[PDB]
XYZ file of C-alpha atoms in Angstrom:
515
model
C -137.281 146.336 -62.894
C -139.997 143.939 -61.972
C -143.045 145.809 -63.266
C -146.889 144.278 -62.216
C -148.695 143.372 -65.007
C -151.452 145.879 -66.098
C -149.269 148.392 -65.239
C -149.385 151.202 -67.958
C -145.644 152.905 -68.293
C -144.984 156.276 -68.830
C -143.920 157.104 -72.267
C -140.898 158.581 -70.931
C -138.592 156.778 -68.986
C -136.624 159.436 -67.346
C -135.690 160.199 -63.566
C -134.198 162.975 -62.217
C -132.568 161.924 -59.028
C -131.323 164.705 -56.303
C -128.119 163.973 -54.354
C -126.498 165.689 -51.697
C -123.796 167.361 -53.292
C -121.487 167.026 -56.173
C -120.264 163.399 -56.677
C -116.130 163.292 -55.791
C -114.617 160.192 -57.163
C -116.700 157.875 -59.040
C -113.787 155.283 -58.725
C -114.928 152.932 -56.348
C -111.520 152.504 -54.613
C -111.669 156.541 -53.918
C -114.729 157.239 -53.608
C -116.066 159.191 -49.774
C -119.386 160.188 -49.651
C -123.180 159.170 -50.829
C -123.304 161.287 -53.690
C -120.787 159.531 -55.453
C -121.449 156.284 -53.853
C -125.326 156.466 -55.404
C -124.096 156.948 -58.846
C -121.599 154.458 -58.436
C -124.262 151.896 -57.571
C -125.448 152.441 -61.380
C -122.288 152.285 -63.050
C -120.862 149.410 -61.122
C -122.131 146.416 -60.539
C -120.673 143.891 -57.536
C -120.505 139.827 -56.454
C -124.232 140.384 -55.368
C -126.360 143.259 -55.082
C -129.059 143.363 -52.173
C -132.759 143.880 -53.022
C -135.477 146.190 -50.744
C -136.015 143.750 -48.276
C -131.911 143.635 -47.649
C -131.605 140.159 -49.571
C -129.064 139.042 -51.149
C -129.177 138.260 -55.001
C -126.684 137.811 -57.528
C -124.929 140.834 -59.227
C -121.951 139.255 -61.369
C -122.030 136.186 -59.399
C -124.506 133.514 -59.521
C -123.758 131.008 -56.756
C -121.748 131.510 -53.755
C -121.053 128.564 -51.264
C -118.930 128.049 -48.309
C -119.578 124.582 -45.574
C -116.931 126.599 -42.875
C -118.103 130.420 -43.342
C -114.342 131.085 -43.760
C -113.361 129.809 -47.924
C -116.149 130.967 -50.018
C -116.527 129.714 -53.601
C -118.352 132.637 -55.926
C -119.676 131.565 -59.851
C -119.564 133.931 -61.875
C -121.814 134.248 -64.674
C -120.581 134.076 -67.919
C -122.875 136.932 -69.745
C -121.437 139.677 -67.376
C -120.230 142.534 -69.255
C -118.388 145.667 -69.010
C -120.351 148.795 -70.931
C -117.602 148.179 -74.059
C -118.923 144.755 -74.458
C -115.897 142.668 -72.768
C -116.596 139.975 -70.263
C -116.338 140.523 -66.588
C -114.189 137.586 -65.313
C -112.735 136.322 -61.624
C -109.534 138.108 -62.784
C -111.411 141.620 -62.455
C -111.969 141.067 -59.101
C -108.482 140.045 -58.053
C -107.107 142.836 -59.626
C -110.038 145.355 -57.939
C -110.095 143.826 -54.709
C -105.943 143.920 -54.474
C -106.119 147.255 -55.867
C -108.862 148.481 -52.959
C -106.010 147.336 -50.184
C -102.848 148.638 -52.234
C -101.163 151.799 -50.469
C -100.525 153.272 -53.866
C -104.729 153.727 -54.206
C -104.738 155.655 -50.900
C -108.720 153.838 -50.618
C -110.610 156.036 -48.080
C -112.296 152.216 -47.618
C -109.316 150.112 -48.167
C -110.355 149.302 -44.465
C -113.824 147.702 -45.466
C -111.597 144.750 -46.651
C -110.412 144.000 -43.319
C -113.976 144.389 -41.776
C -114.522 141.750 -44.511
C -111.489 139.548 -43.147
C -110.176 138.906 -46.541
C -106.828 137.120 -45.587
C -103.883 139.602 -45.247
C -105.836 142.340 -46.207
C -104.755 144.510 -43.202
C -100.896 143.799 -44.023
C -101.296 144.959 -47.336
C -102.589 147.967 -46.652
C -99.830 148.677 -43.631
C -97.326 147.728 -46.689
C -96.209 144.641 -44.928
C -97.505 142.501 -47.293
C -97.538 142.911 -51.786
C -100.994 142.945 -53.188
C -101.209 139.465 -54.054
C -101.019 138.141 -50.744
C -104.494 139.273 -50.703
C -106.972 136.160 -49.933
C -108.824 135.964 -53.465
C -107.760 133.930 -56.214
C -109.611 133.367 -59.902
C -109.868 129.738 -59.902
C -110.660 130.470 -63.646
C -112.646 133.064 -65.245
C -115.983 132.234 -64.212
C -114.915 130.818 -60.377
C -113.805 133.169 -57.285
C -112.180 131.995 -54.354
C -111.738 133.940 -51.204
C -109.851 132.721 -48.013
C -110.562 134.537 -44.670
C -109.086 135.041 -41.760
C -111.803 133.807 -39.453
C -115.444 132.548 -39.973
C -117.782 135.198 -41.769
C -121.266 133.784 -42.312
C -122.187 137.046 -43.400
C -119.135 137.547 -45.728
C -121.505 137.438 -49.021
C -123.509 140.229 -47.323
C -120.290 142.750 -47.359
C -119.893 141.824 -51.117
C -122.645 144.111 -52.141
C -120.839 147.395 -51.121
C -119.162 149.443 -53.336
C -115.370 149.317 -52.443
C -115.882 145.771 -53.554
C -117.110 146.295 -56.934
C -114.680 145.707 -59.777
C -112.964 147.996 -62.350
C -111.886 147.563 -65.709
C -107.903 147.538 -65.639
C -107.472 148.472 -69.080
C -109.855 151.347 -68.410
C -108.124 152.191 -65.055
C -104.892 152.241 -66.302
C -105.527 154.748 -68.756
C -104.910 157.559 -66.626
C -106.955 160.294 -64.785
C -108.942 161.041 -67.354
C -110.768 157.224 -66.985
C -113.872 158.390 -65.507
C -114.869 161.164 -67.298
C -117.859 160.702 -69.077
C -117.626 158.731 -72.413
C -114.359 157.374 -70.755
C -115.534 156.056 -67.686
C -116.164 151.921 -68.469
C -118.249 149.887 -65.736
C -119.893 146.775 -65.271
C -123.342 147.919 -64.061
C -126.803 148.503 -65.497
C -126.108 152.430 -66.822
C -123.330 153.725 -68.174
C -122.031 157.397 -67.973
C -123.019 159.849 -70.534
C -122.839 163.445 -69.987
C -121.721 165.518 -67.028
C -121.608 169.398 -66.299
C -119.407 169.756 -63.351
C -121.801 171.222 -60.363
C -124.664 170.754 -62.269
C -125.492 167.171 -63.664
C -124.422 163.474 -64.220
C -126.358 161.568 -66.773
C -126.437 158.083 -67.220
C -128.211 155.669 -70.080
C -128.361 152.162 -69.925
C -125.543 149.896 -70.692
C -126.987 147.771 -72.680
C -124.401 145.077 -72.356
C -125.702 144.731 -68.539
C -126.510 140.847 -68.465
C -130.186 141.964 -66.650
C -130.493 145.076 -69.254
C -133.854 143.283 -70.634
C -135.495 143.936 -67.822
C -133.770 147.859 -67.615
C -137.100 150.502 -67.629
C -135.526 154.109 -67.260
C -133.739 154.984 -70.657
C -132.153 158.247 -69.029
C -131.662 159.144 -65.162
C -130.302 162.581 -64.183
C -128.453 162.862 -61.219
C -128.784 167.003 -59.491
C -126.470 167.557 -56.964
C -127.893 170.229 -54.705
C -126.573 170.659 -51.352
C -128.894 173.293 -50.391
C -131.189 171.670 -47.403
C -134.456 173.551 -48.563
C -133.961 174.142 -52.382
C -134.488 170.961 -53.236
C -137.274 170.442 -51.894
C -138.689 173.200 -53.258
C -137.506 172.418 -56.751
C -138.837 168.853 -56.242
C -142.504 170.482 -55.663
C -141.745 172.787 -58.647
C -141.637 169.023 -60.407
C -137.889 169.308 -61.379
C -137.305 166.756 -59.259
C -138.770 163.109 -58.877
C -136.771 162.075 -55.910
C -134.894 164.432 -52.891
C -132.328 163.205 -50.140
C -133.516 164.360 -46.760
C -135.603 167.767 -45.696
C -135.452 169.761 -42.717
C -136.997 169.542 -40.208
C -138.642 173.021 -40.061
C -140.160 171.950 -43.150
C -141.769 168.676 -42.533
C -144.447 169.442 -41.136
C -146.042 171.199 -44.049
C -144.811 168.447 -45.775
C -146.695 165.952 -43.677
C -149.782 168.089 -44.667
C -149.437 168.809 -48.295
C -148.278 165.915 -49.576
C -148.126 163.011 -46.684
C -148.572 160.726 -49.596
C -144.961 161.812 -50.962
C -143.026 161.570 -47.713
C -141.169 158.690 -46.525
C -139.297 158.426 -43.275
C -138.183 154.417 -43.055
C -136.032 153.232 -40.099
C -132.193 152.882 -41.362
C -129.403 150.979 -40.208
C -128.263 153.103 -37.364
C -128.671 153.430 -33.425
C -128.585 156.490 -31.333
C -127.507 154.698 -27.903
C -126.192 155.972 -24.050
C -123.401 153.462 -23.299
C -122.580 152.959 -19.461
C -119.880 152.259 -17.836
C -120.236 148.647 -16.764
C -117.007 148.300 -14.975
C -116.734 151.583 -12.671
C -119.065 153.582 -10.626
C -122.594 152.833 -9.867
C -123.170 151.860 -13.740
C -121.317 148.648 -12.890
C -124.413 147.709 -10.993
C -126.784 146.395 -13.675
C -129.859 147.499 -11.545
C -128.689 150.982 -11.818
C -128.106 150.656 -15.655
C -131.623 148.822 -15.966
C -133.104 152.128 -13.763
C -131.766 154.416 -16.258
C -132.548 152.920 -19.316
C -136.340 151.964 -18.375
C -136.693 155.696 -17.707
C -135.873 157.108 -21.058
C -139.207 158.168 -22.435
C -138.253 156.696 -25.861
C -141.666 157.664 -27.489
C -141.805 160.885 -25.857
C -137.959 161.506 -27.415
C -139.052 160.650 -30.822
C -142.092 162.388 -31.001
C -141.411 165.684 -28.952
C -137.685 165.748 -29.146
C -136.994 165.211 -32.065
C -140.462 164.862 -34.018
C -139.134 163.661 -37.274
C -140.159 160.404 -37.754
C -137.383 158.659 -35.818
C -138.970 155.641 -34.255
C -138.159 154.372 -30.563
C -135.181 151.597 -30.464
C -136.135 148.556 -28.194
C -133.353 146.891 -29.690
C -129.998 147.628 -30.161
C -129.856 146.331 -33.660
C -132.620 148.498 -36.239
C -135.882 145.864 -36.132
C -135.514 146.377 -39.794
C -132.173 144.795 -40.248
C -131.646 142.219 -42.921
C -132.212 138.446 -41.668
C -133.213 139.965 -38.260
C -136.470 139.400 -37.014
C -137.015 140.499 -33.391
C -138.870 139.320 -30.010
C -140.522 142.056 -29.226
C -139.336 143.889 -26.229
C -141.278 143.966 -22.892
C -141.114 147.135 -22.496
C -142.116 148.621 -25.763
C -145.667 147.474 -24.037
C -145.707 148.969 -21.187
C -146.560 152.596 -20.137
C -143.713 154.893 -19.149
C -145.465 154.708 -15.485
C -144.769 151.590 -14.269
C -141.431 151.593 -16.563
C -140.969 154.233 -13.735
C -141.989 152.172 -10.932
C -139.704 149.373 -11.478
C -136.880 151.309 -11.840
C -137.403 152.715 -8.746
C -137.455 149.819 -7.145
C -134.199 148.710 -8.706
C -132.618 151.431 -8.069
C -133.550 151.123 -4.027
C -132.521 147.586 -4.273
C -129.637 148.920 -5.392
C -128.483 150.723 -2.318
C -129.052 154.301 -3.696
C -131.820 156.810 -2.574
C -131.572 159.623 0.208
C -128.794 158.200 2.409
C -126.775 157.666 -0.668
C -128.238 159.332 -3.754
C -127.174 158.327 -6.690
C -124.923 160.751 -8.856
C -123.745 160.019 -12.099
C -122.642 162.654 -15.633
C -123.663 162.063 -18.605
C -121.120 163.005 -21.544
C -121.326 164.017 -24.726
C -119.427 166.455 -27.486
C -119.835 169.676 -28.050
C -122.373 169.913 -30.276
C -126.393 171.265 -30.554
C -128.068 167.781 -31.336
C -125.862 165.815 -28.679
C -127.215 168.804 -26.085
C -130.486 168.646 -27.037
C -130.653 165.157 -26.406
C -129.016 164.860 -23.482
C -130.629 167.827 -21.836
C -134.184 165.972 -22.651
C -133.001 162.860 -21.324
C -131.708 164.338 -18.231
C -134.993 165.800 -17.038
C -136.658 162.056 -17.889
C -134.223 161.202 -15.160
C -134.805 163.381 -12.684
C -138.885 163.517 -13.609
C -138.952 159.348 -14.136
C -136.283 158.432 -11.494
C -136.111 160.720 -8.719
C -132.268 161.198 -9.672
C -129.841 164.330 -10.661
C -127.654 163.917 -13.545
C -124.957 166.442 -14.155
C -124.292 167.081 -17.588
C -120.753 167.420 -19.341
C -120.032 168.321 -22.689
C -116.178 168.371 -24.279
C -114.630 168.790 -27.041
C -114.403 166.411 -29.559
C -110.604 165.124 -28.793
C -111.550 165.672 -25.039
C -114.577 163.034 -25.301
C -112.542 160.874 -27.325
C -110.329 160.500 -25.004
C -113.011 159.895 -22.280
C -114.754 157.448 -24.588
C -112.178 155.144 -25.263
C -110.411 155.459 -21.676
C -113.419 154.749 -20.038
C -113.347 158.040 -18.113
C -117.141 158.452 -17.961
C -120.536 157.421 -15.964
C -122.684 157.628 -18.996
C -121.746 158.764 -22.340
C -123.653 158.987 -25.874
C -122.713 156.962 -28.718
C -124.128 155.667 -31.875
C -123.321 153.078 -34.616
C -123.964 153.351 -38.094
C -123.800 149.317 -39.883
C -120.711 149.027 -42.181
C -123.022 146.149 -43.988
C -127.104 145.008 -43.787
C -126.542 142.531 -41.432
C -127.216 142.572 -37.251
C -123.784 141.087 -36.658
C -122.328 144.677 -37.434
C -124.253 146.119 -34.160
C -124.257 142.913 -32.618
C -120.296 142.101 -32.319
C -119.493 145.825 -30.640
C -120.446 144.243 -27.000
C -118.091 141.372 -27.274
C -115.992 141.082 -24.209
C -112.549 142.199 -26.433
C -114.149 143.953 -29.157
C -112.392 147.534 -29.948
C -115.734 149.281 -30.373
C -117.213 147.896 -26.814
C -117.419 151.227 -25.663
C -119.656 150.175 -22.364
C -116.739 147.540 -21.095
C -119.309 145.156 -20.954
C -117.683 141.785 -20.154
C -120.294 139.156 -20.442
C -119.324 135.618 -21.132
C -122.891 134.610 -21.755
C -123.039 137.316 -24.474
C -119.860 136.520 -25.843
C -121.008 132.609 -26.612
C -124.093 133.545 -28.403
C -121.940 135.815 -30.767
C -119.727 132.900 -31.483
C -122.805 130.750 -31.911
C -123.800 133.182 -34.519
C -120.598 133.441 -36.479
C -120.791 129.527 -36.900
C -124.725 129.296 -38.122
C -125.341 129.031 -42.134
C -128.532 129.810 -42.076
C -130.329 133.392 -41.365
C -133.031 131.400 -39.344
C -130.709 130.083 -37.212
C -128.247 133.040 -36.938
C -131.704 135.250 -36.277
C -132.160 132.790 -33.184
C -128.566 134.207 -31.854
C -129.081 137.669 -32.532
C -132.231 137.611 -30.650
C -130.698 135.876 -27.210
C -128.097 138.751 -28.101
C -130.567 141.551 -27.944
C -132.191 139.620 -24.925
C -129.205 139.779 -23.452
C -128.707 143.101 -23.546
C -131.929 144.167 -22.613
C -131.496 142.468 -19.593
C -127.849 143.905 -18.569
C -128.431 147.116 -19.984
C -124.800 147.986 -20.626
C -125.903 150.222 -23.128
C -129.510 152.238 -23.759
C -130.897 152.844 -27.263
C -132.962 155.701 -27.618
C -133.657 155.709 -31.156
C -133.110 154.419 -34.714
C -132.222 157.011 -37.436
C -134.100 158.035 -40.260
C -133.457 159.027 -43.643
C -136.522 161.253 -45.038
C -137.517 161.238 -48.575
C -139.795 162.845 -51.078
C -140.853 160.152 -53.692
C -143.095 161.929 -56.559
C -146.343 159.361 -56.964
C -145.153 158.188 -60.836
C -142.014 156.913 -59.301
C -142.135 152.862 -58.455
C -139.380 150.741 -57.856
C -137.303 152.877 -55.091
C -136.201 150.702 -52.310
C -137.278 153.387 -49.615
C -137.676 150.157 -46.853
C -133.859 149.367 -47.303
C -132.188 150.562 -43.919
C -128.957 151.118 -45.549
C -130.696 152.969 -48.310
C -128.914 150.978 -51.254
C -130.573 151.876 -54.811
C -130.336 150.885 -58.688
C -131.840 153.059 -61.212
C -132.125 149.565 -62.736
C -135.057 148.649 -60.049
C -136.787 151.567 -61.025
C -139.949 152.769 -63.418
C -142.153 155.553 -64.138
C -146.354 154.694 -64.210
C -148.545 157.270 -66.266
C -149.833 159.802 -64.028
């Protein structure tokens, strides 16, 4: 933690953190949900960490280089240690990453290694190649060399992901009890000291942690409470110092009673509508633009949602690491002007009384998606003068329509796999598996290919902005709003990275001030 000079710290540096449910596996390679992942970030540490701004800072690795973005070399500190005092070395990572993709591990996140492009990852997952074929080598105890199957300038950002955290072979091979309190040996800032199933997990500092001198909190208690409203009340009662999420029906009262403790930071996700760029009226750029421009994003976030979400003027969330967007020309316009321009575009497209625009908005049966769809269809009727029918389909049918392109407009969403623009922008390249709108634009592909060649964040940002400009002009998709993850944080709790869009936090950065 970085405590600013003058700050008066409380005598008791203990924290109670609420988590949404009982943690499943504390094994990085078997973890599934956020509760265990949040605890894992305190018990283990990857090659690098991600600070509040999303910048990549040293973890076990103190340096990382790659000129071609394909072969990466990480230099590891010589004072990284497991909770039992033994050293963390390059071999620990070779062992752990091989284990991540090993078919025997059945990791729910083995796929992340393939997303990261580590050579032969999928082949190993599929049982076609032995784990030792993975593109990771321990040149020596402090040198880890990685071979990717494509150029990935942002590869290092992915190593901050829990799936790439190291585990200690001797500990793991002791058997199923290896993750129990007193048994789990991680390399993070903390160590699991005690645990009461379905009640609490208590961690204390791993004094062997390389940066332990900066660790302030001496005890952190994770309280799993899968009660949507009770967590908030226990927080108000003083039993919790920080919560995760709160019901919309409680939001207004919280803003009125404790406005200085309510946080609704934009997160790494975008709710959007995808148009069929290959068939129907939506194949015409003018039609897509008109529809995108007539969605009233402020009305959607302020009235329909009303829970803190921000309008999405770009596909990539504006708070994404290394992303400094050029403003969208639509953000500064009154809705009435957008409506007028949209009507002109639609008319130019050849639609009107003689040829009415007939489209259907598709979504999977859901109370949430129905609410948004009804609101958007109303906007199109009032702002663009078009009657867009609504169609809800069962999940299986919805997925089929989505993949096969059997739709005009369809609800969609993307939550970044890592905190860097490429996770969003690569989705629109012509051959990407996740290109729902079926956008096939050579100019766009060219810009994204360019980004994969830029080593600096500054240069890549120029490409990402160029990409967003194309998405704004061609409107293959219509971003609507950016997700949020509401939290309540006590006035005395400092150091929580509330602005990190991926909500990646480590207790080592926190501290309690006298209040």
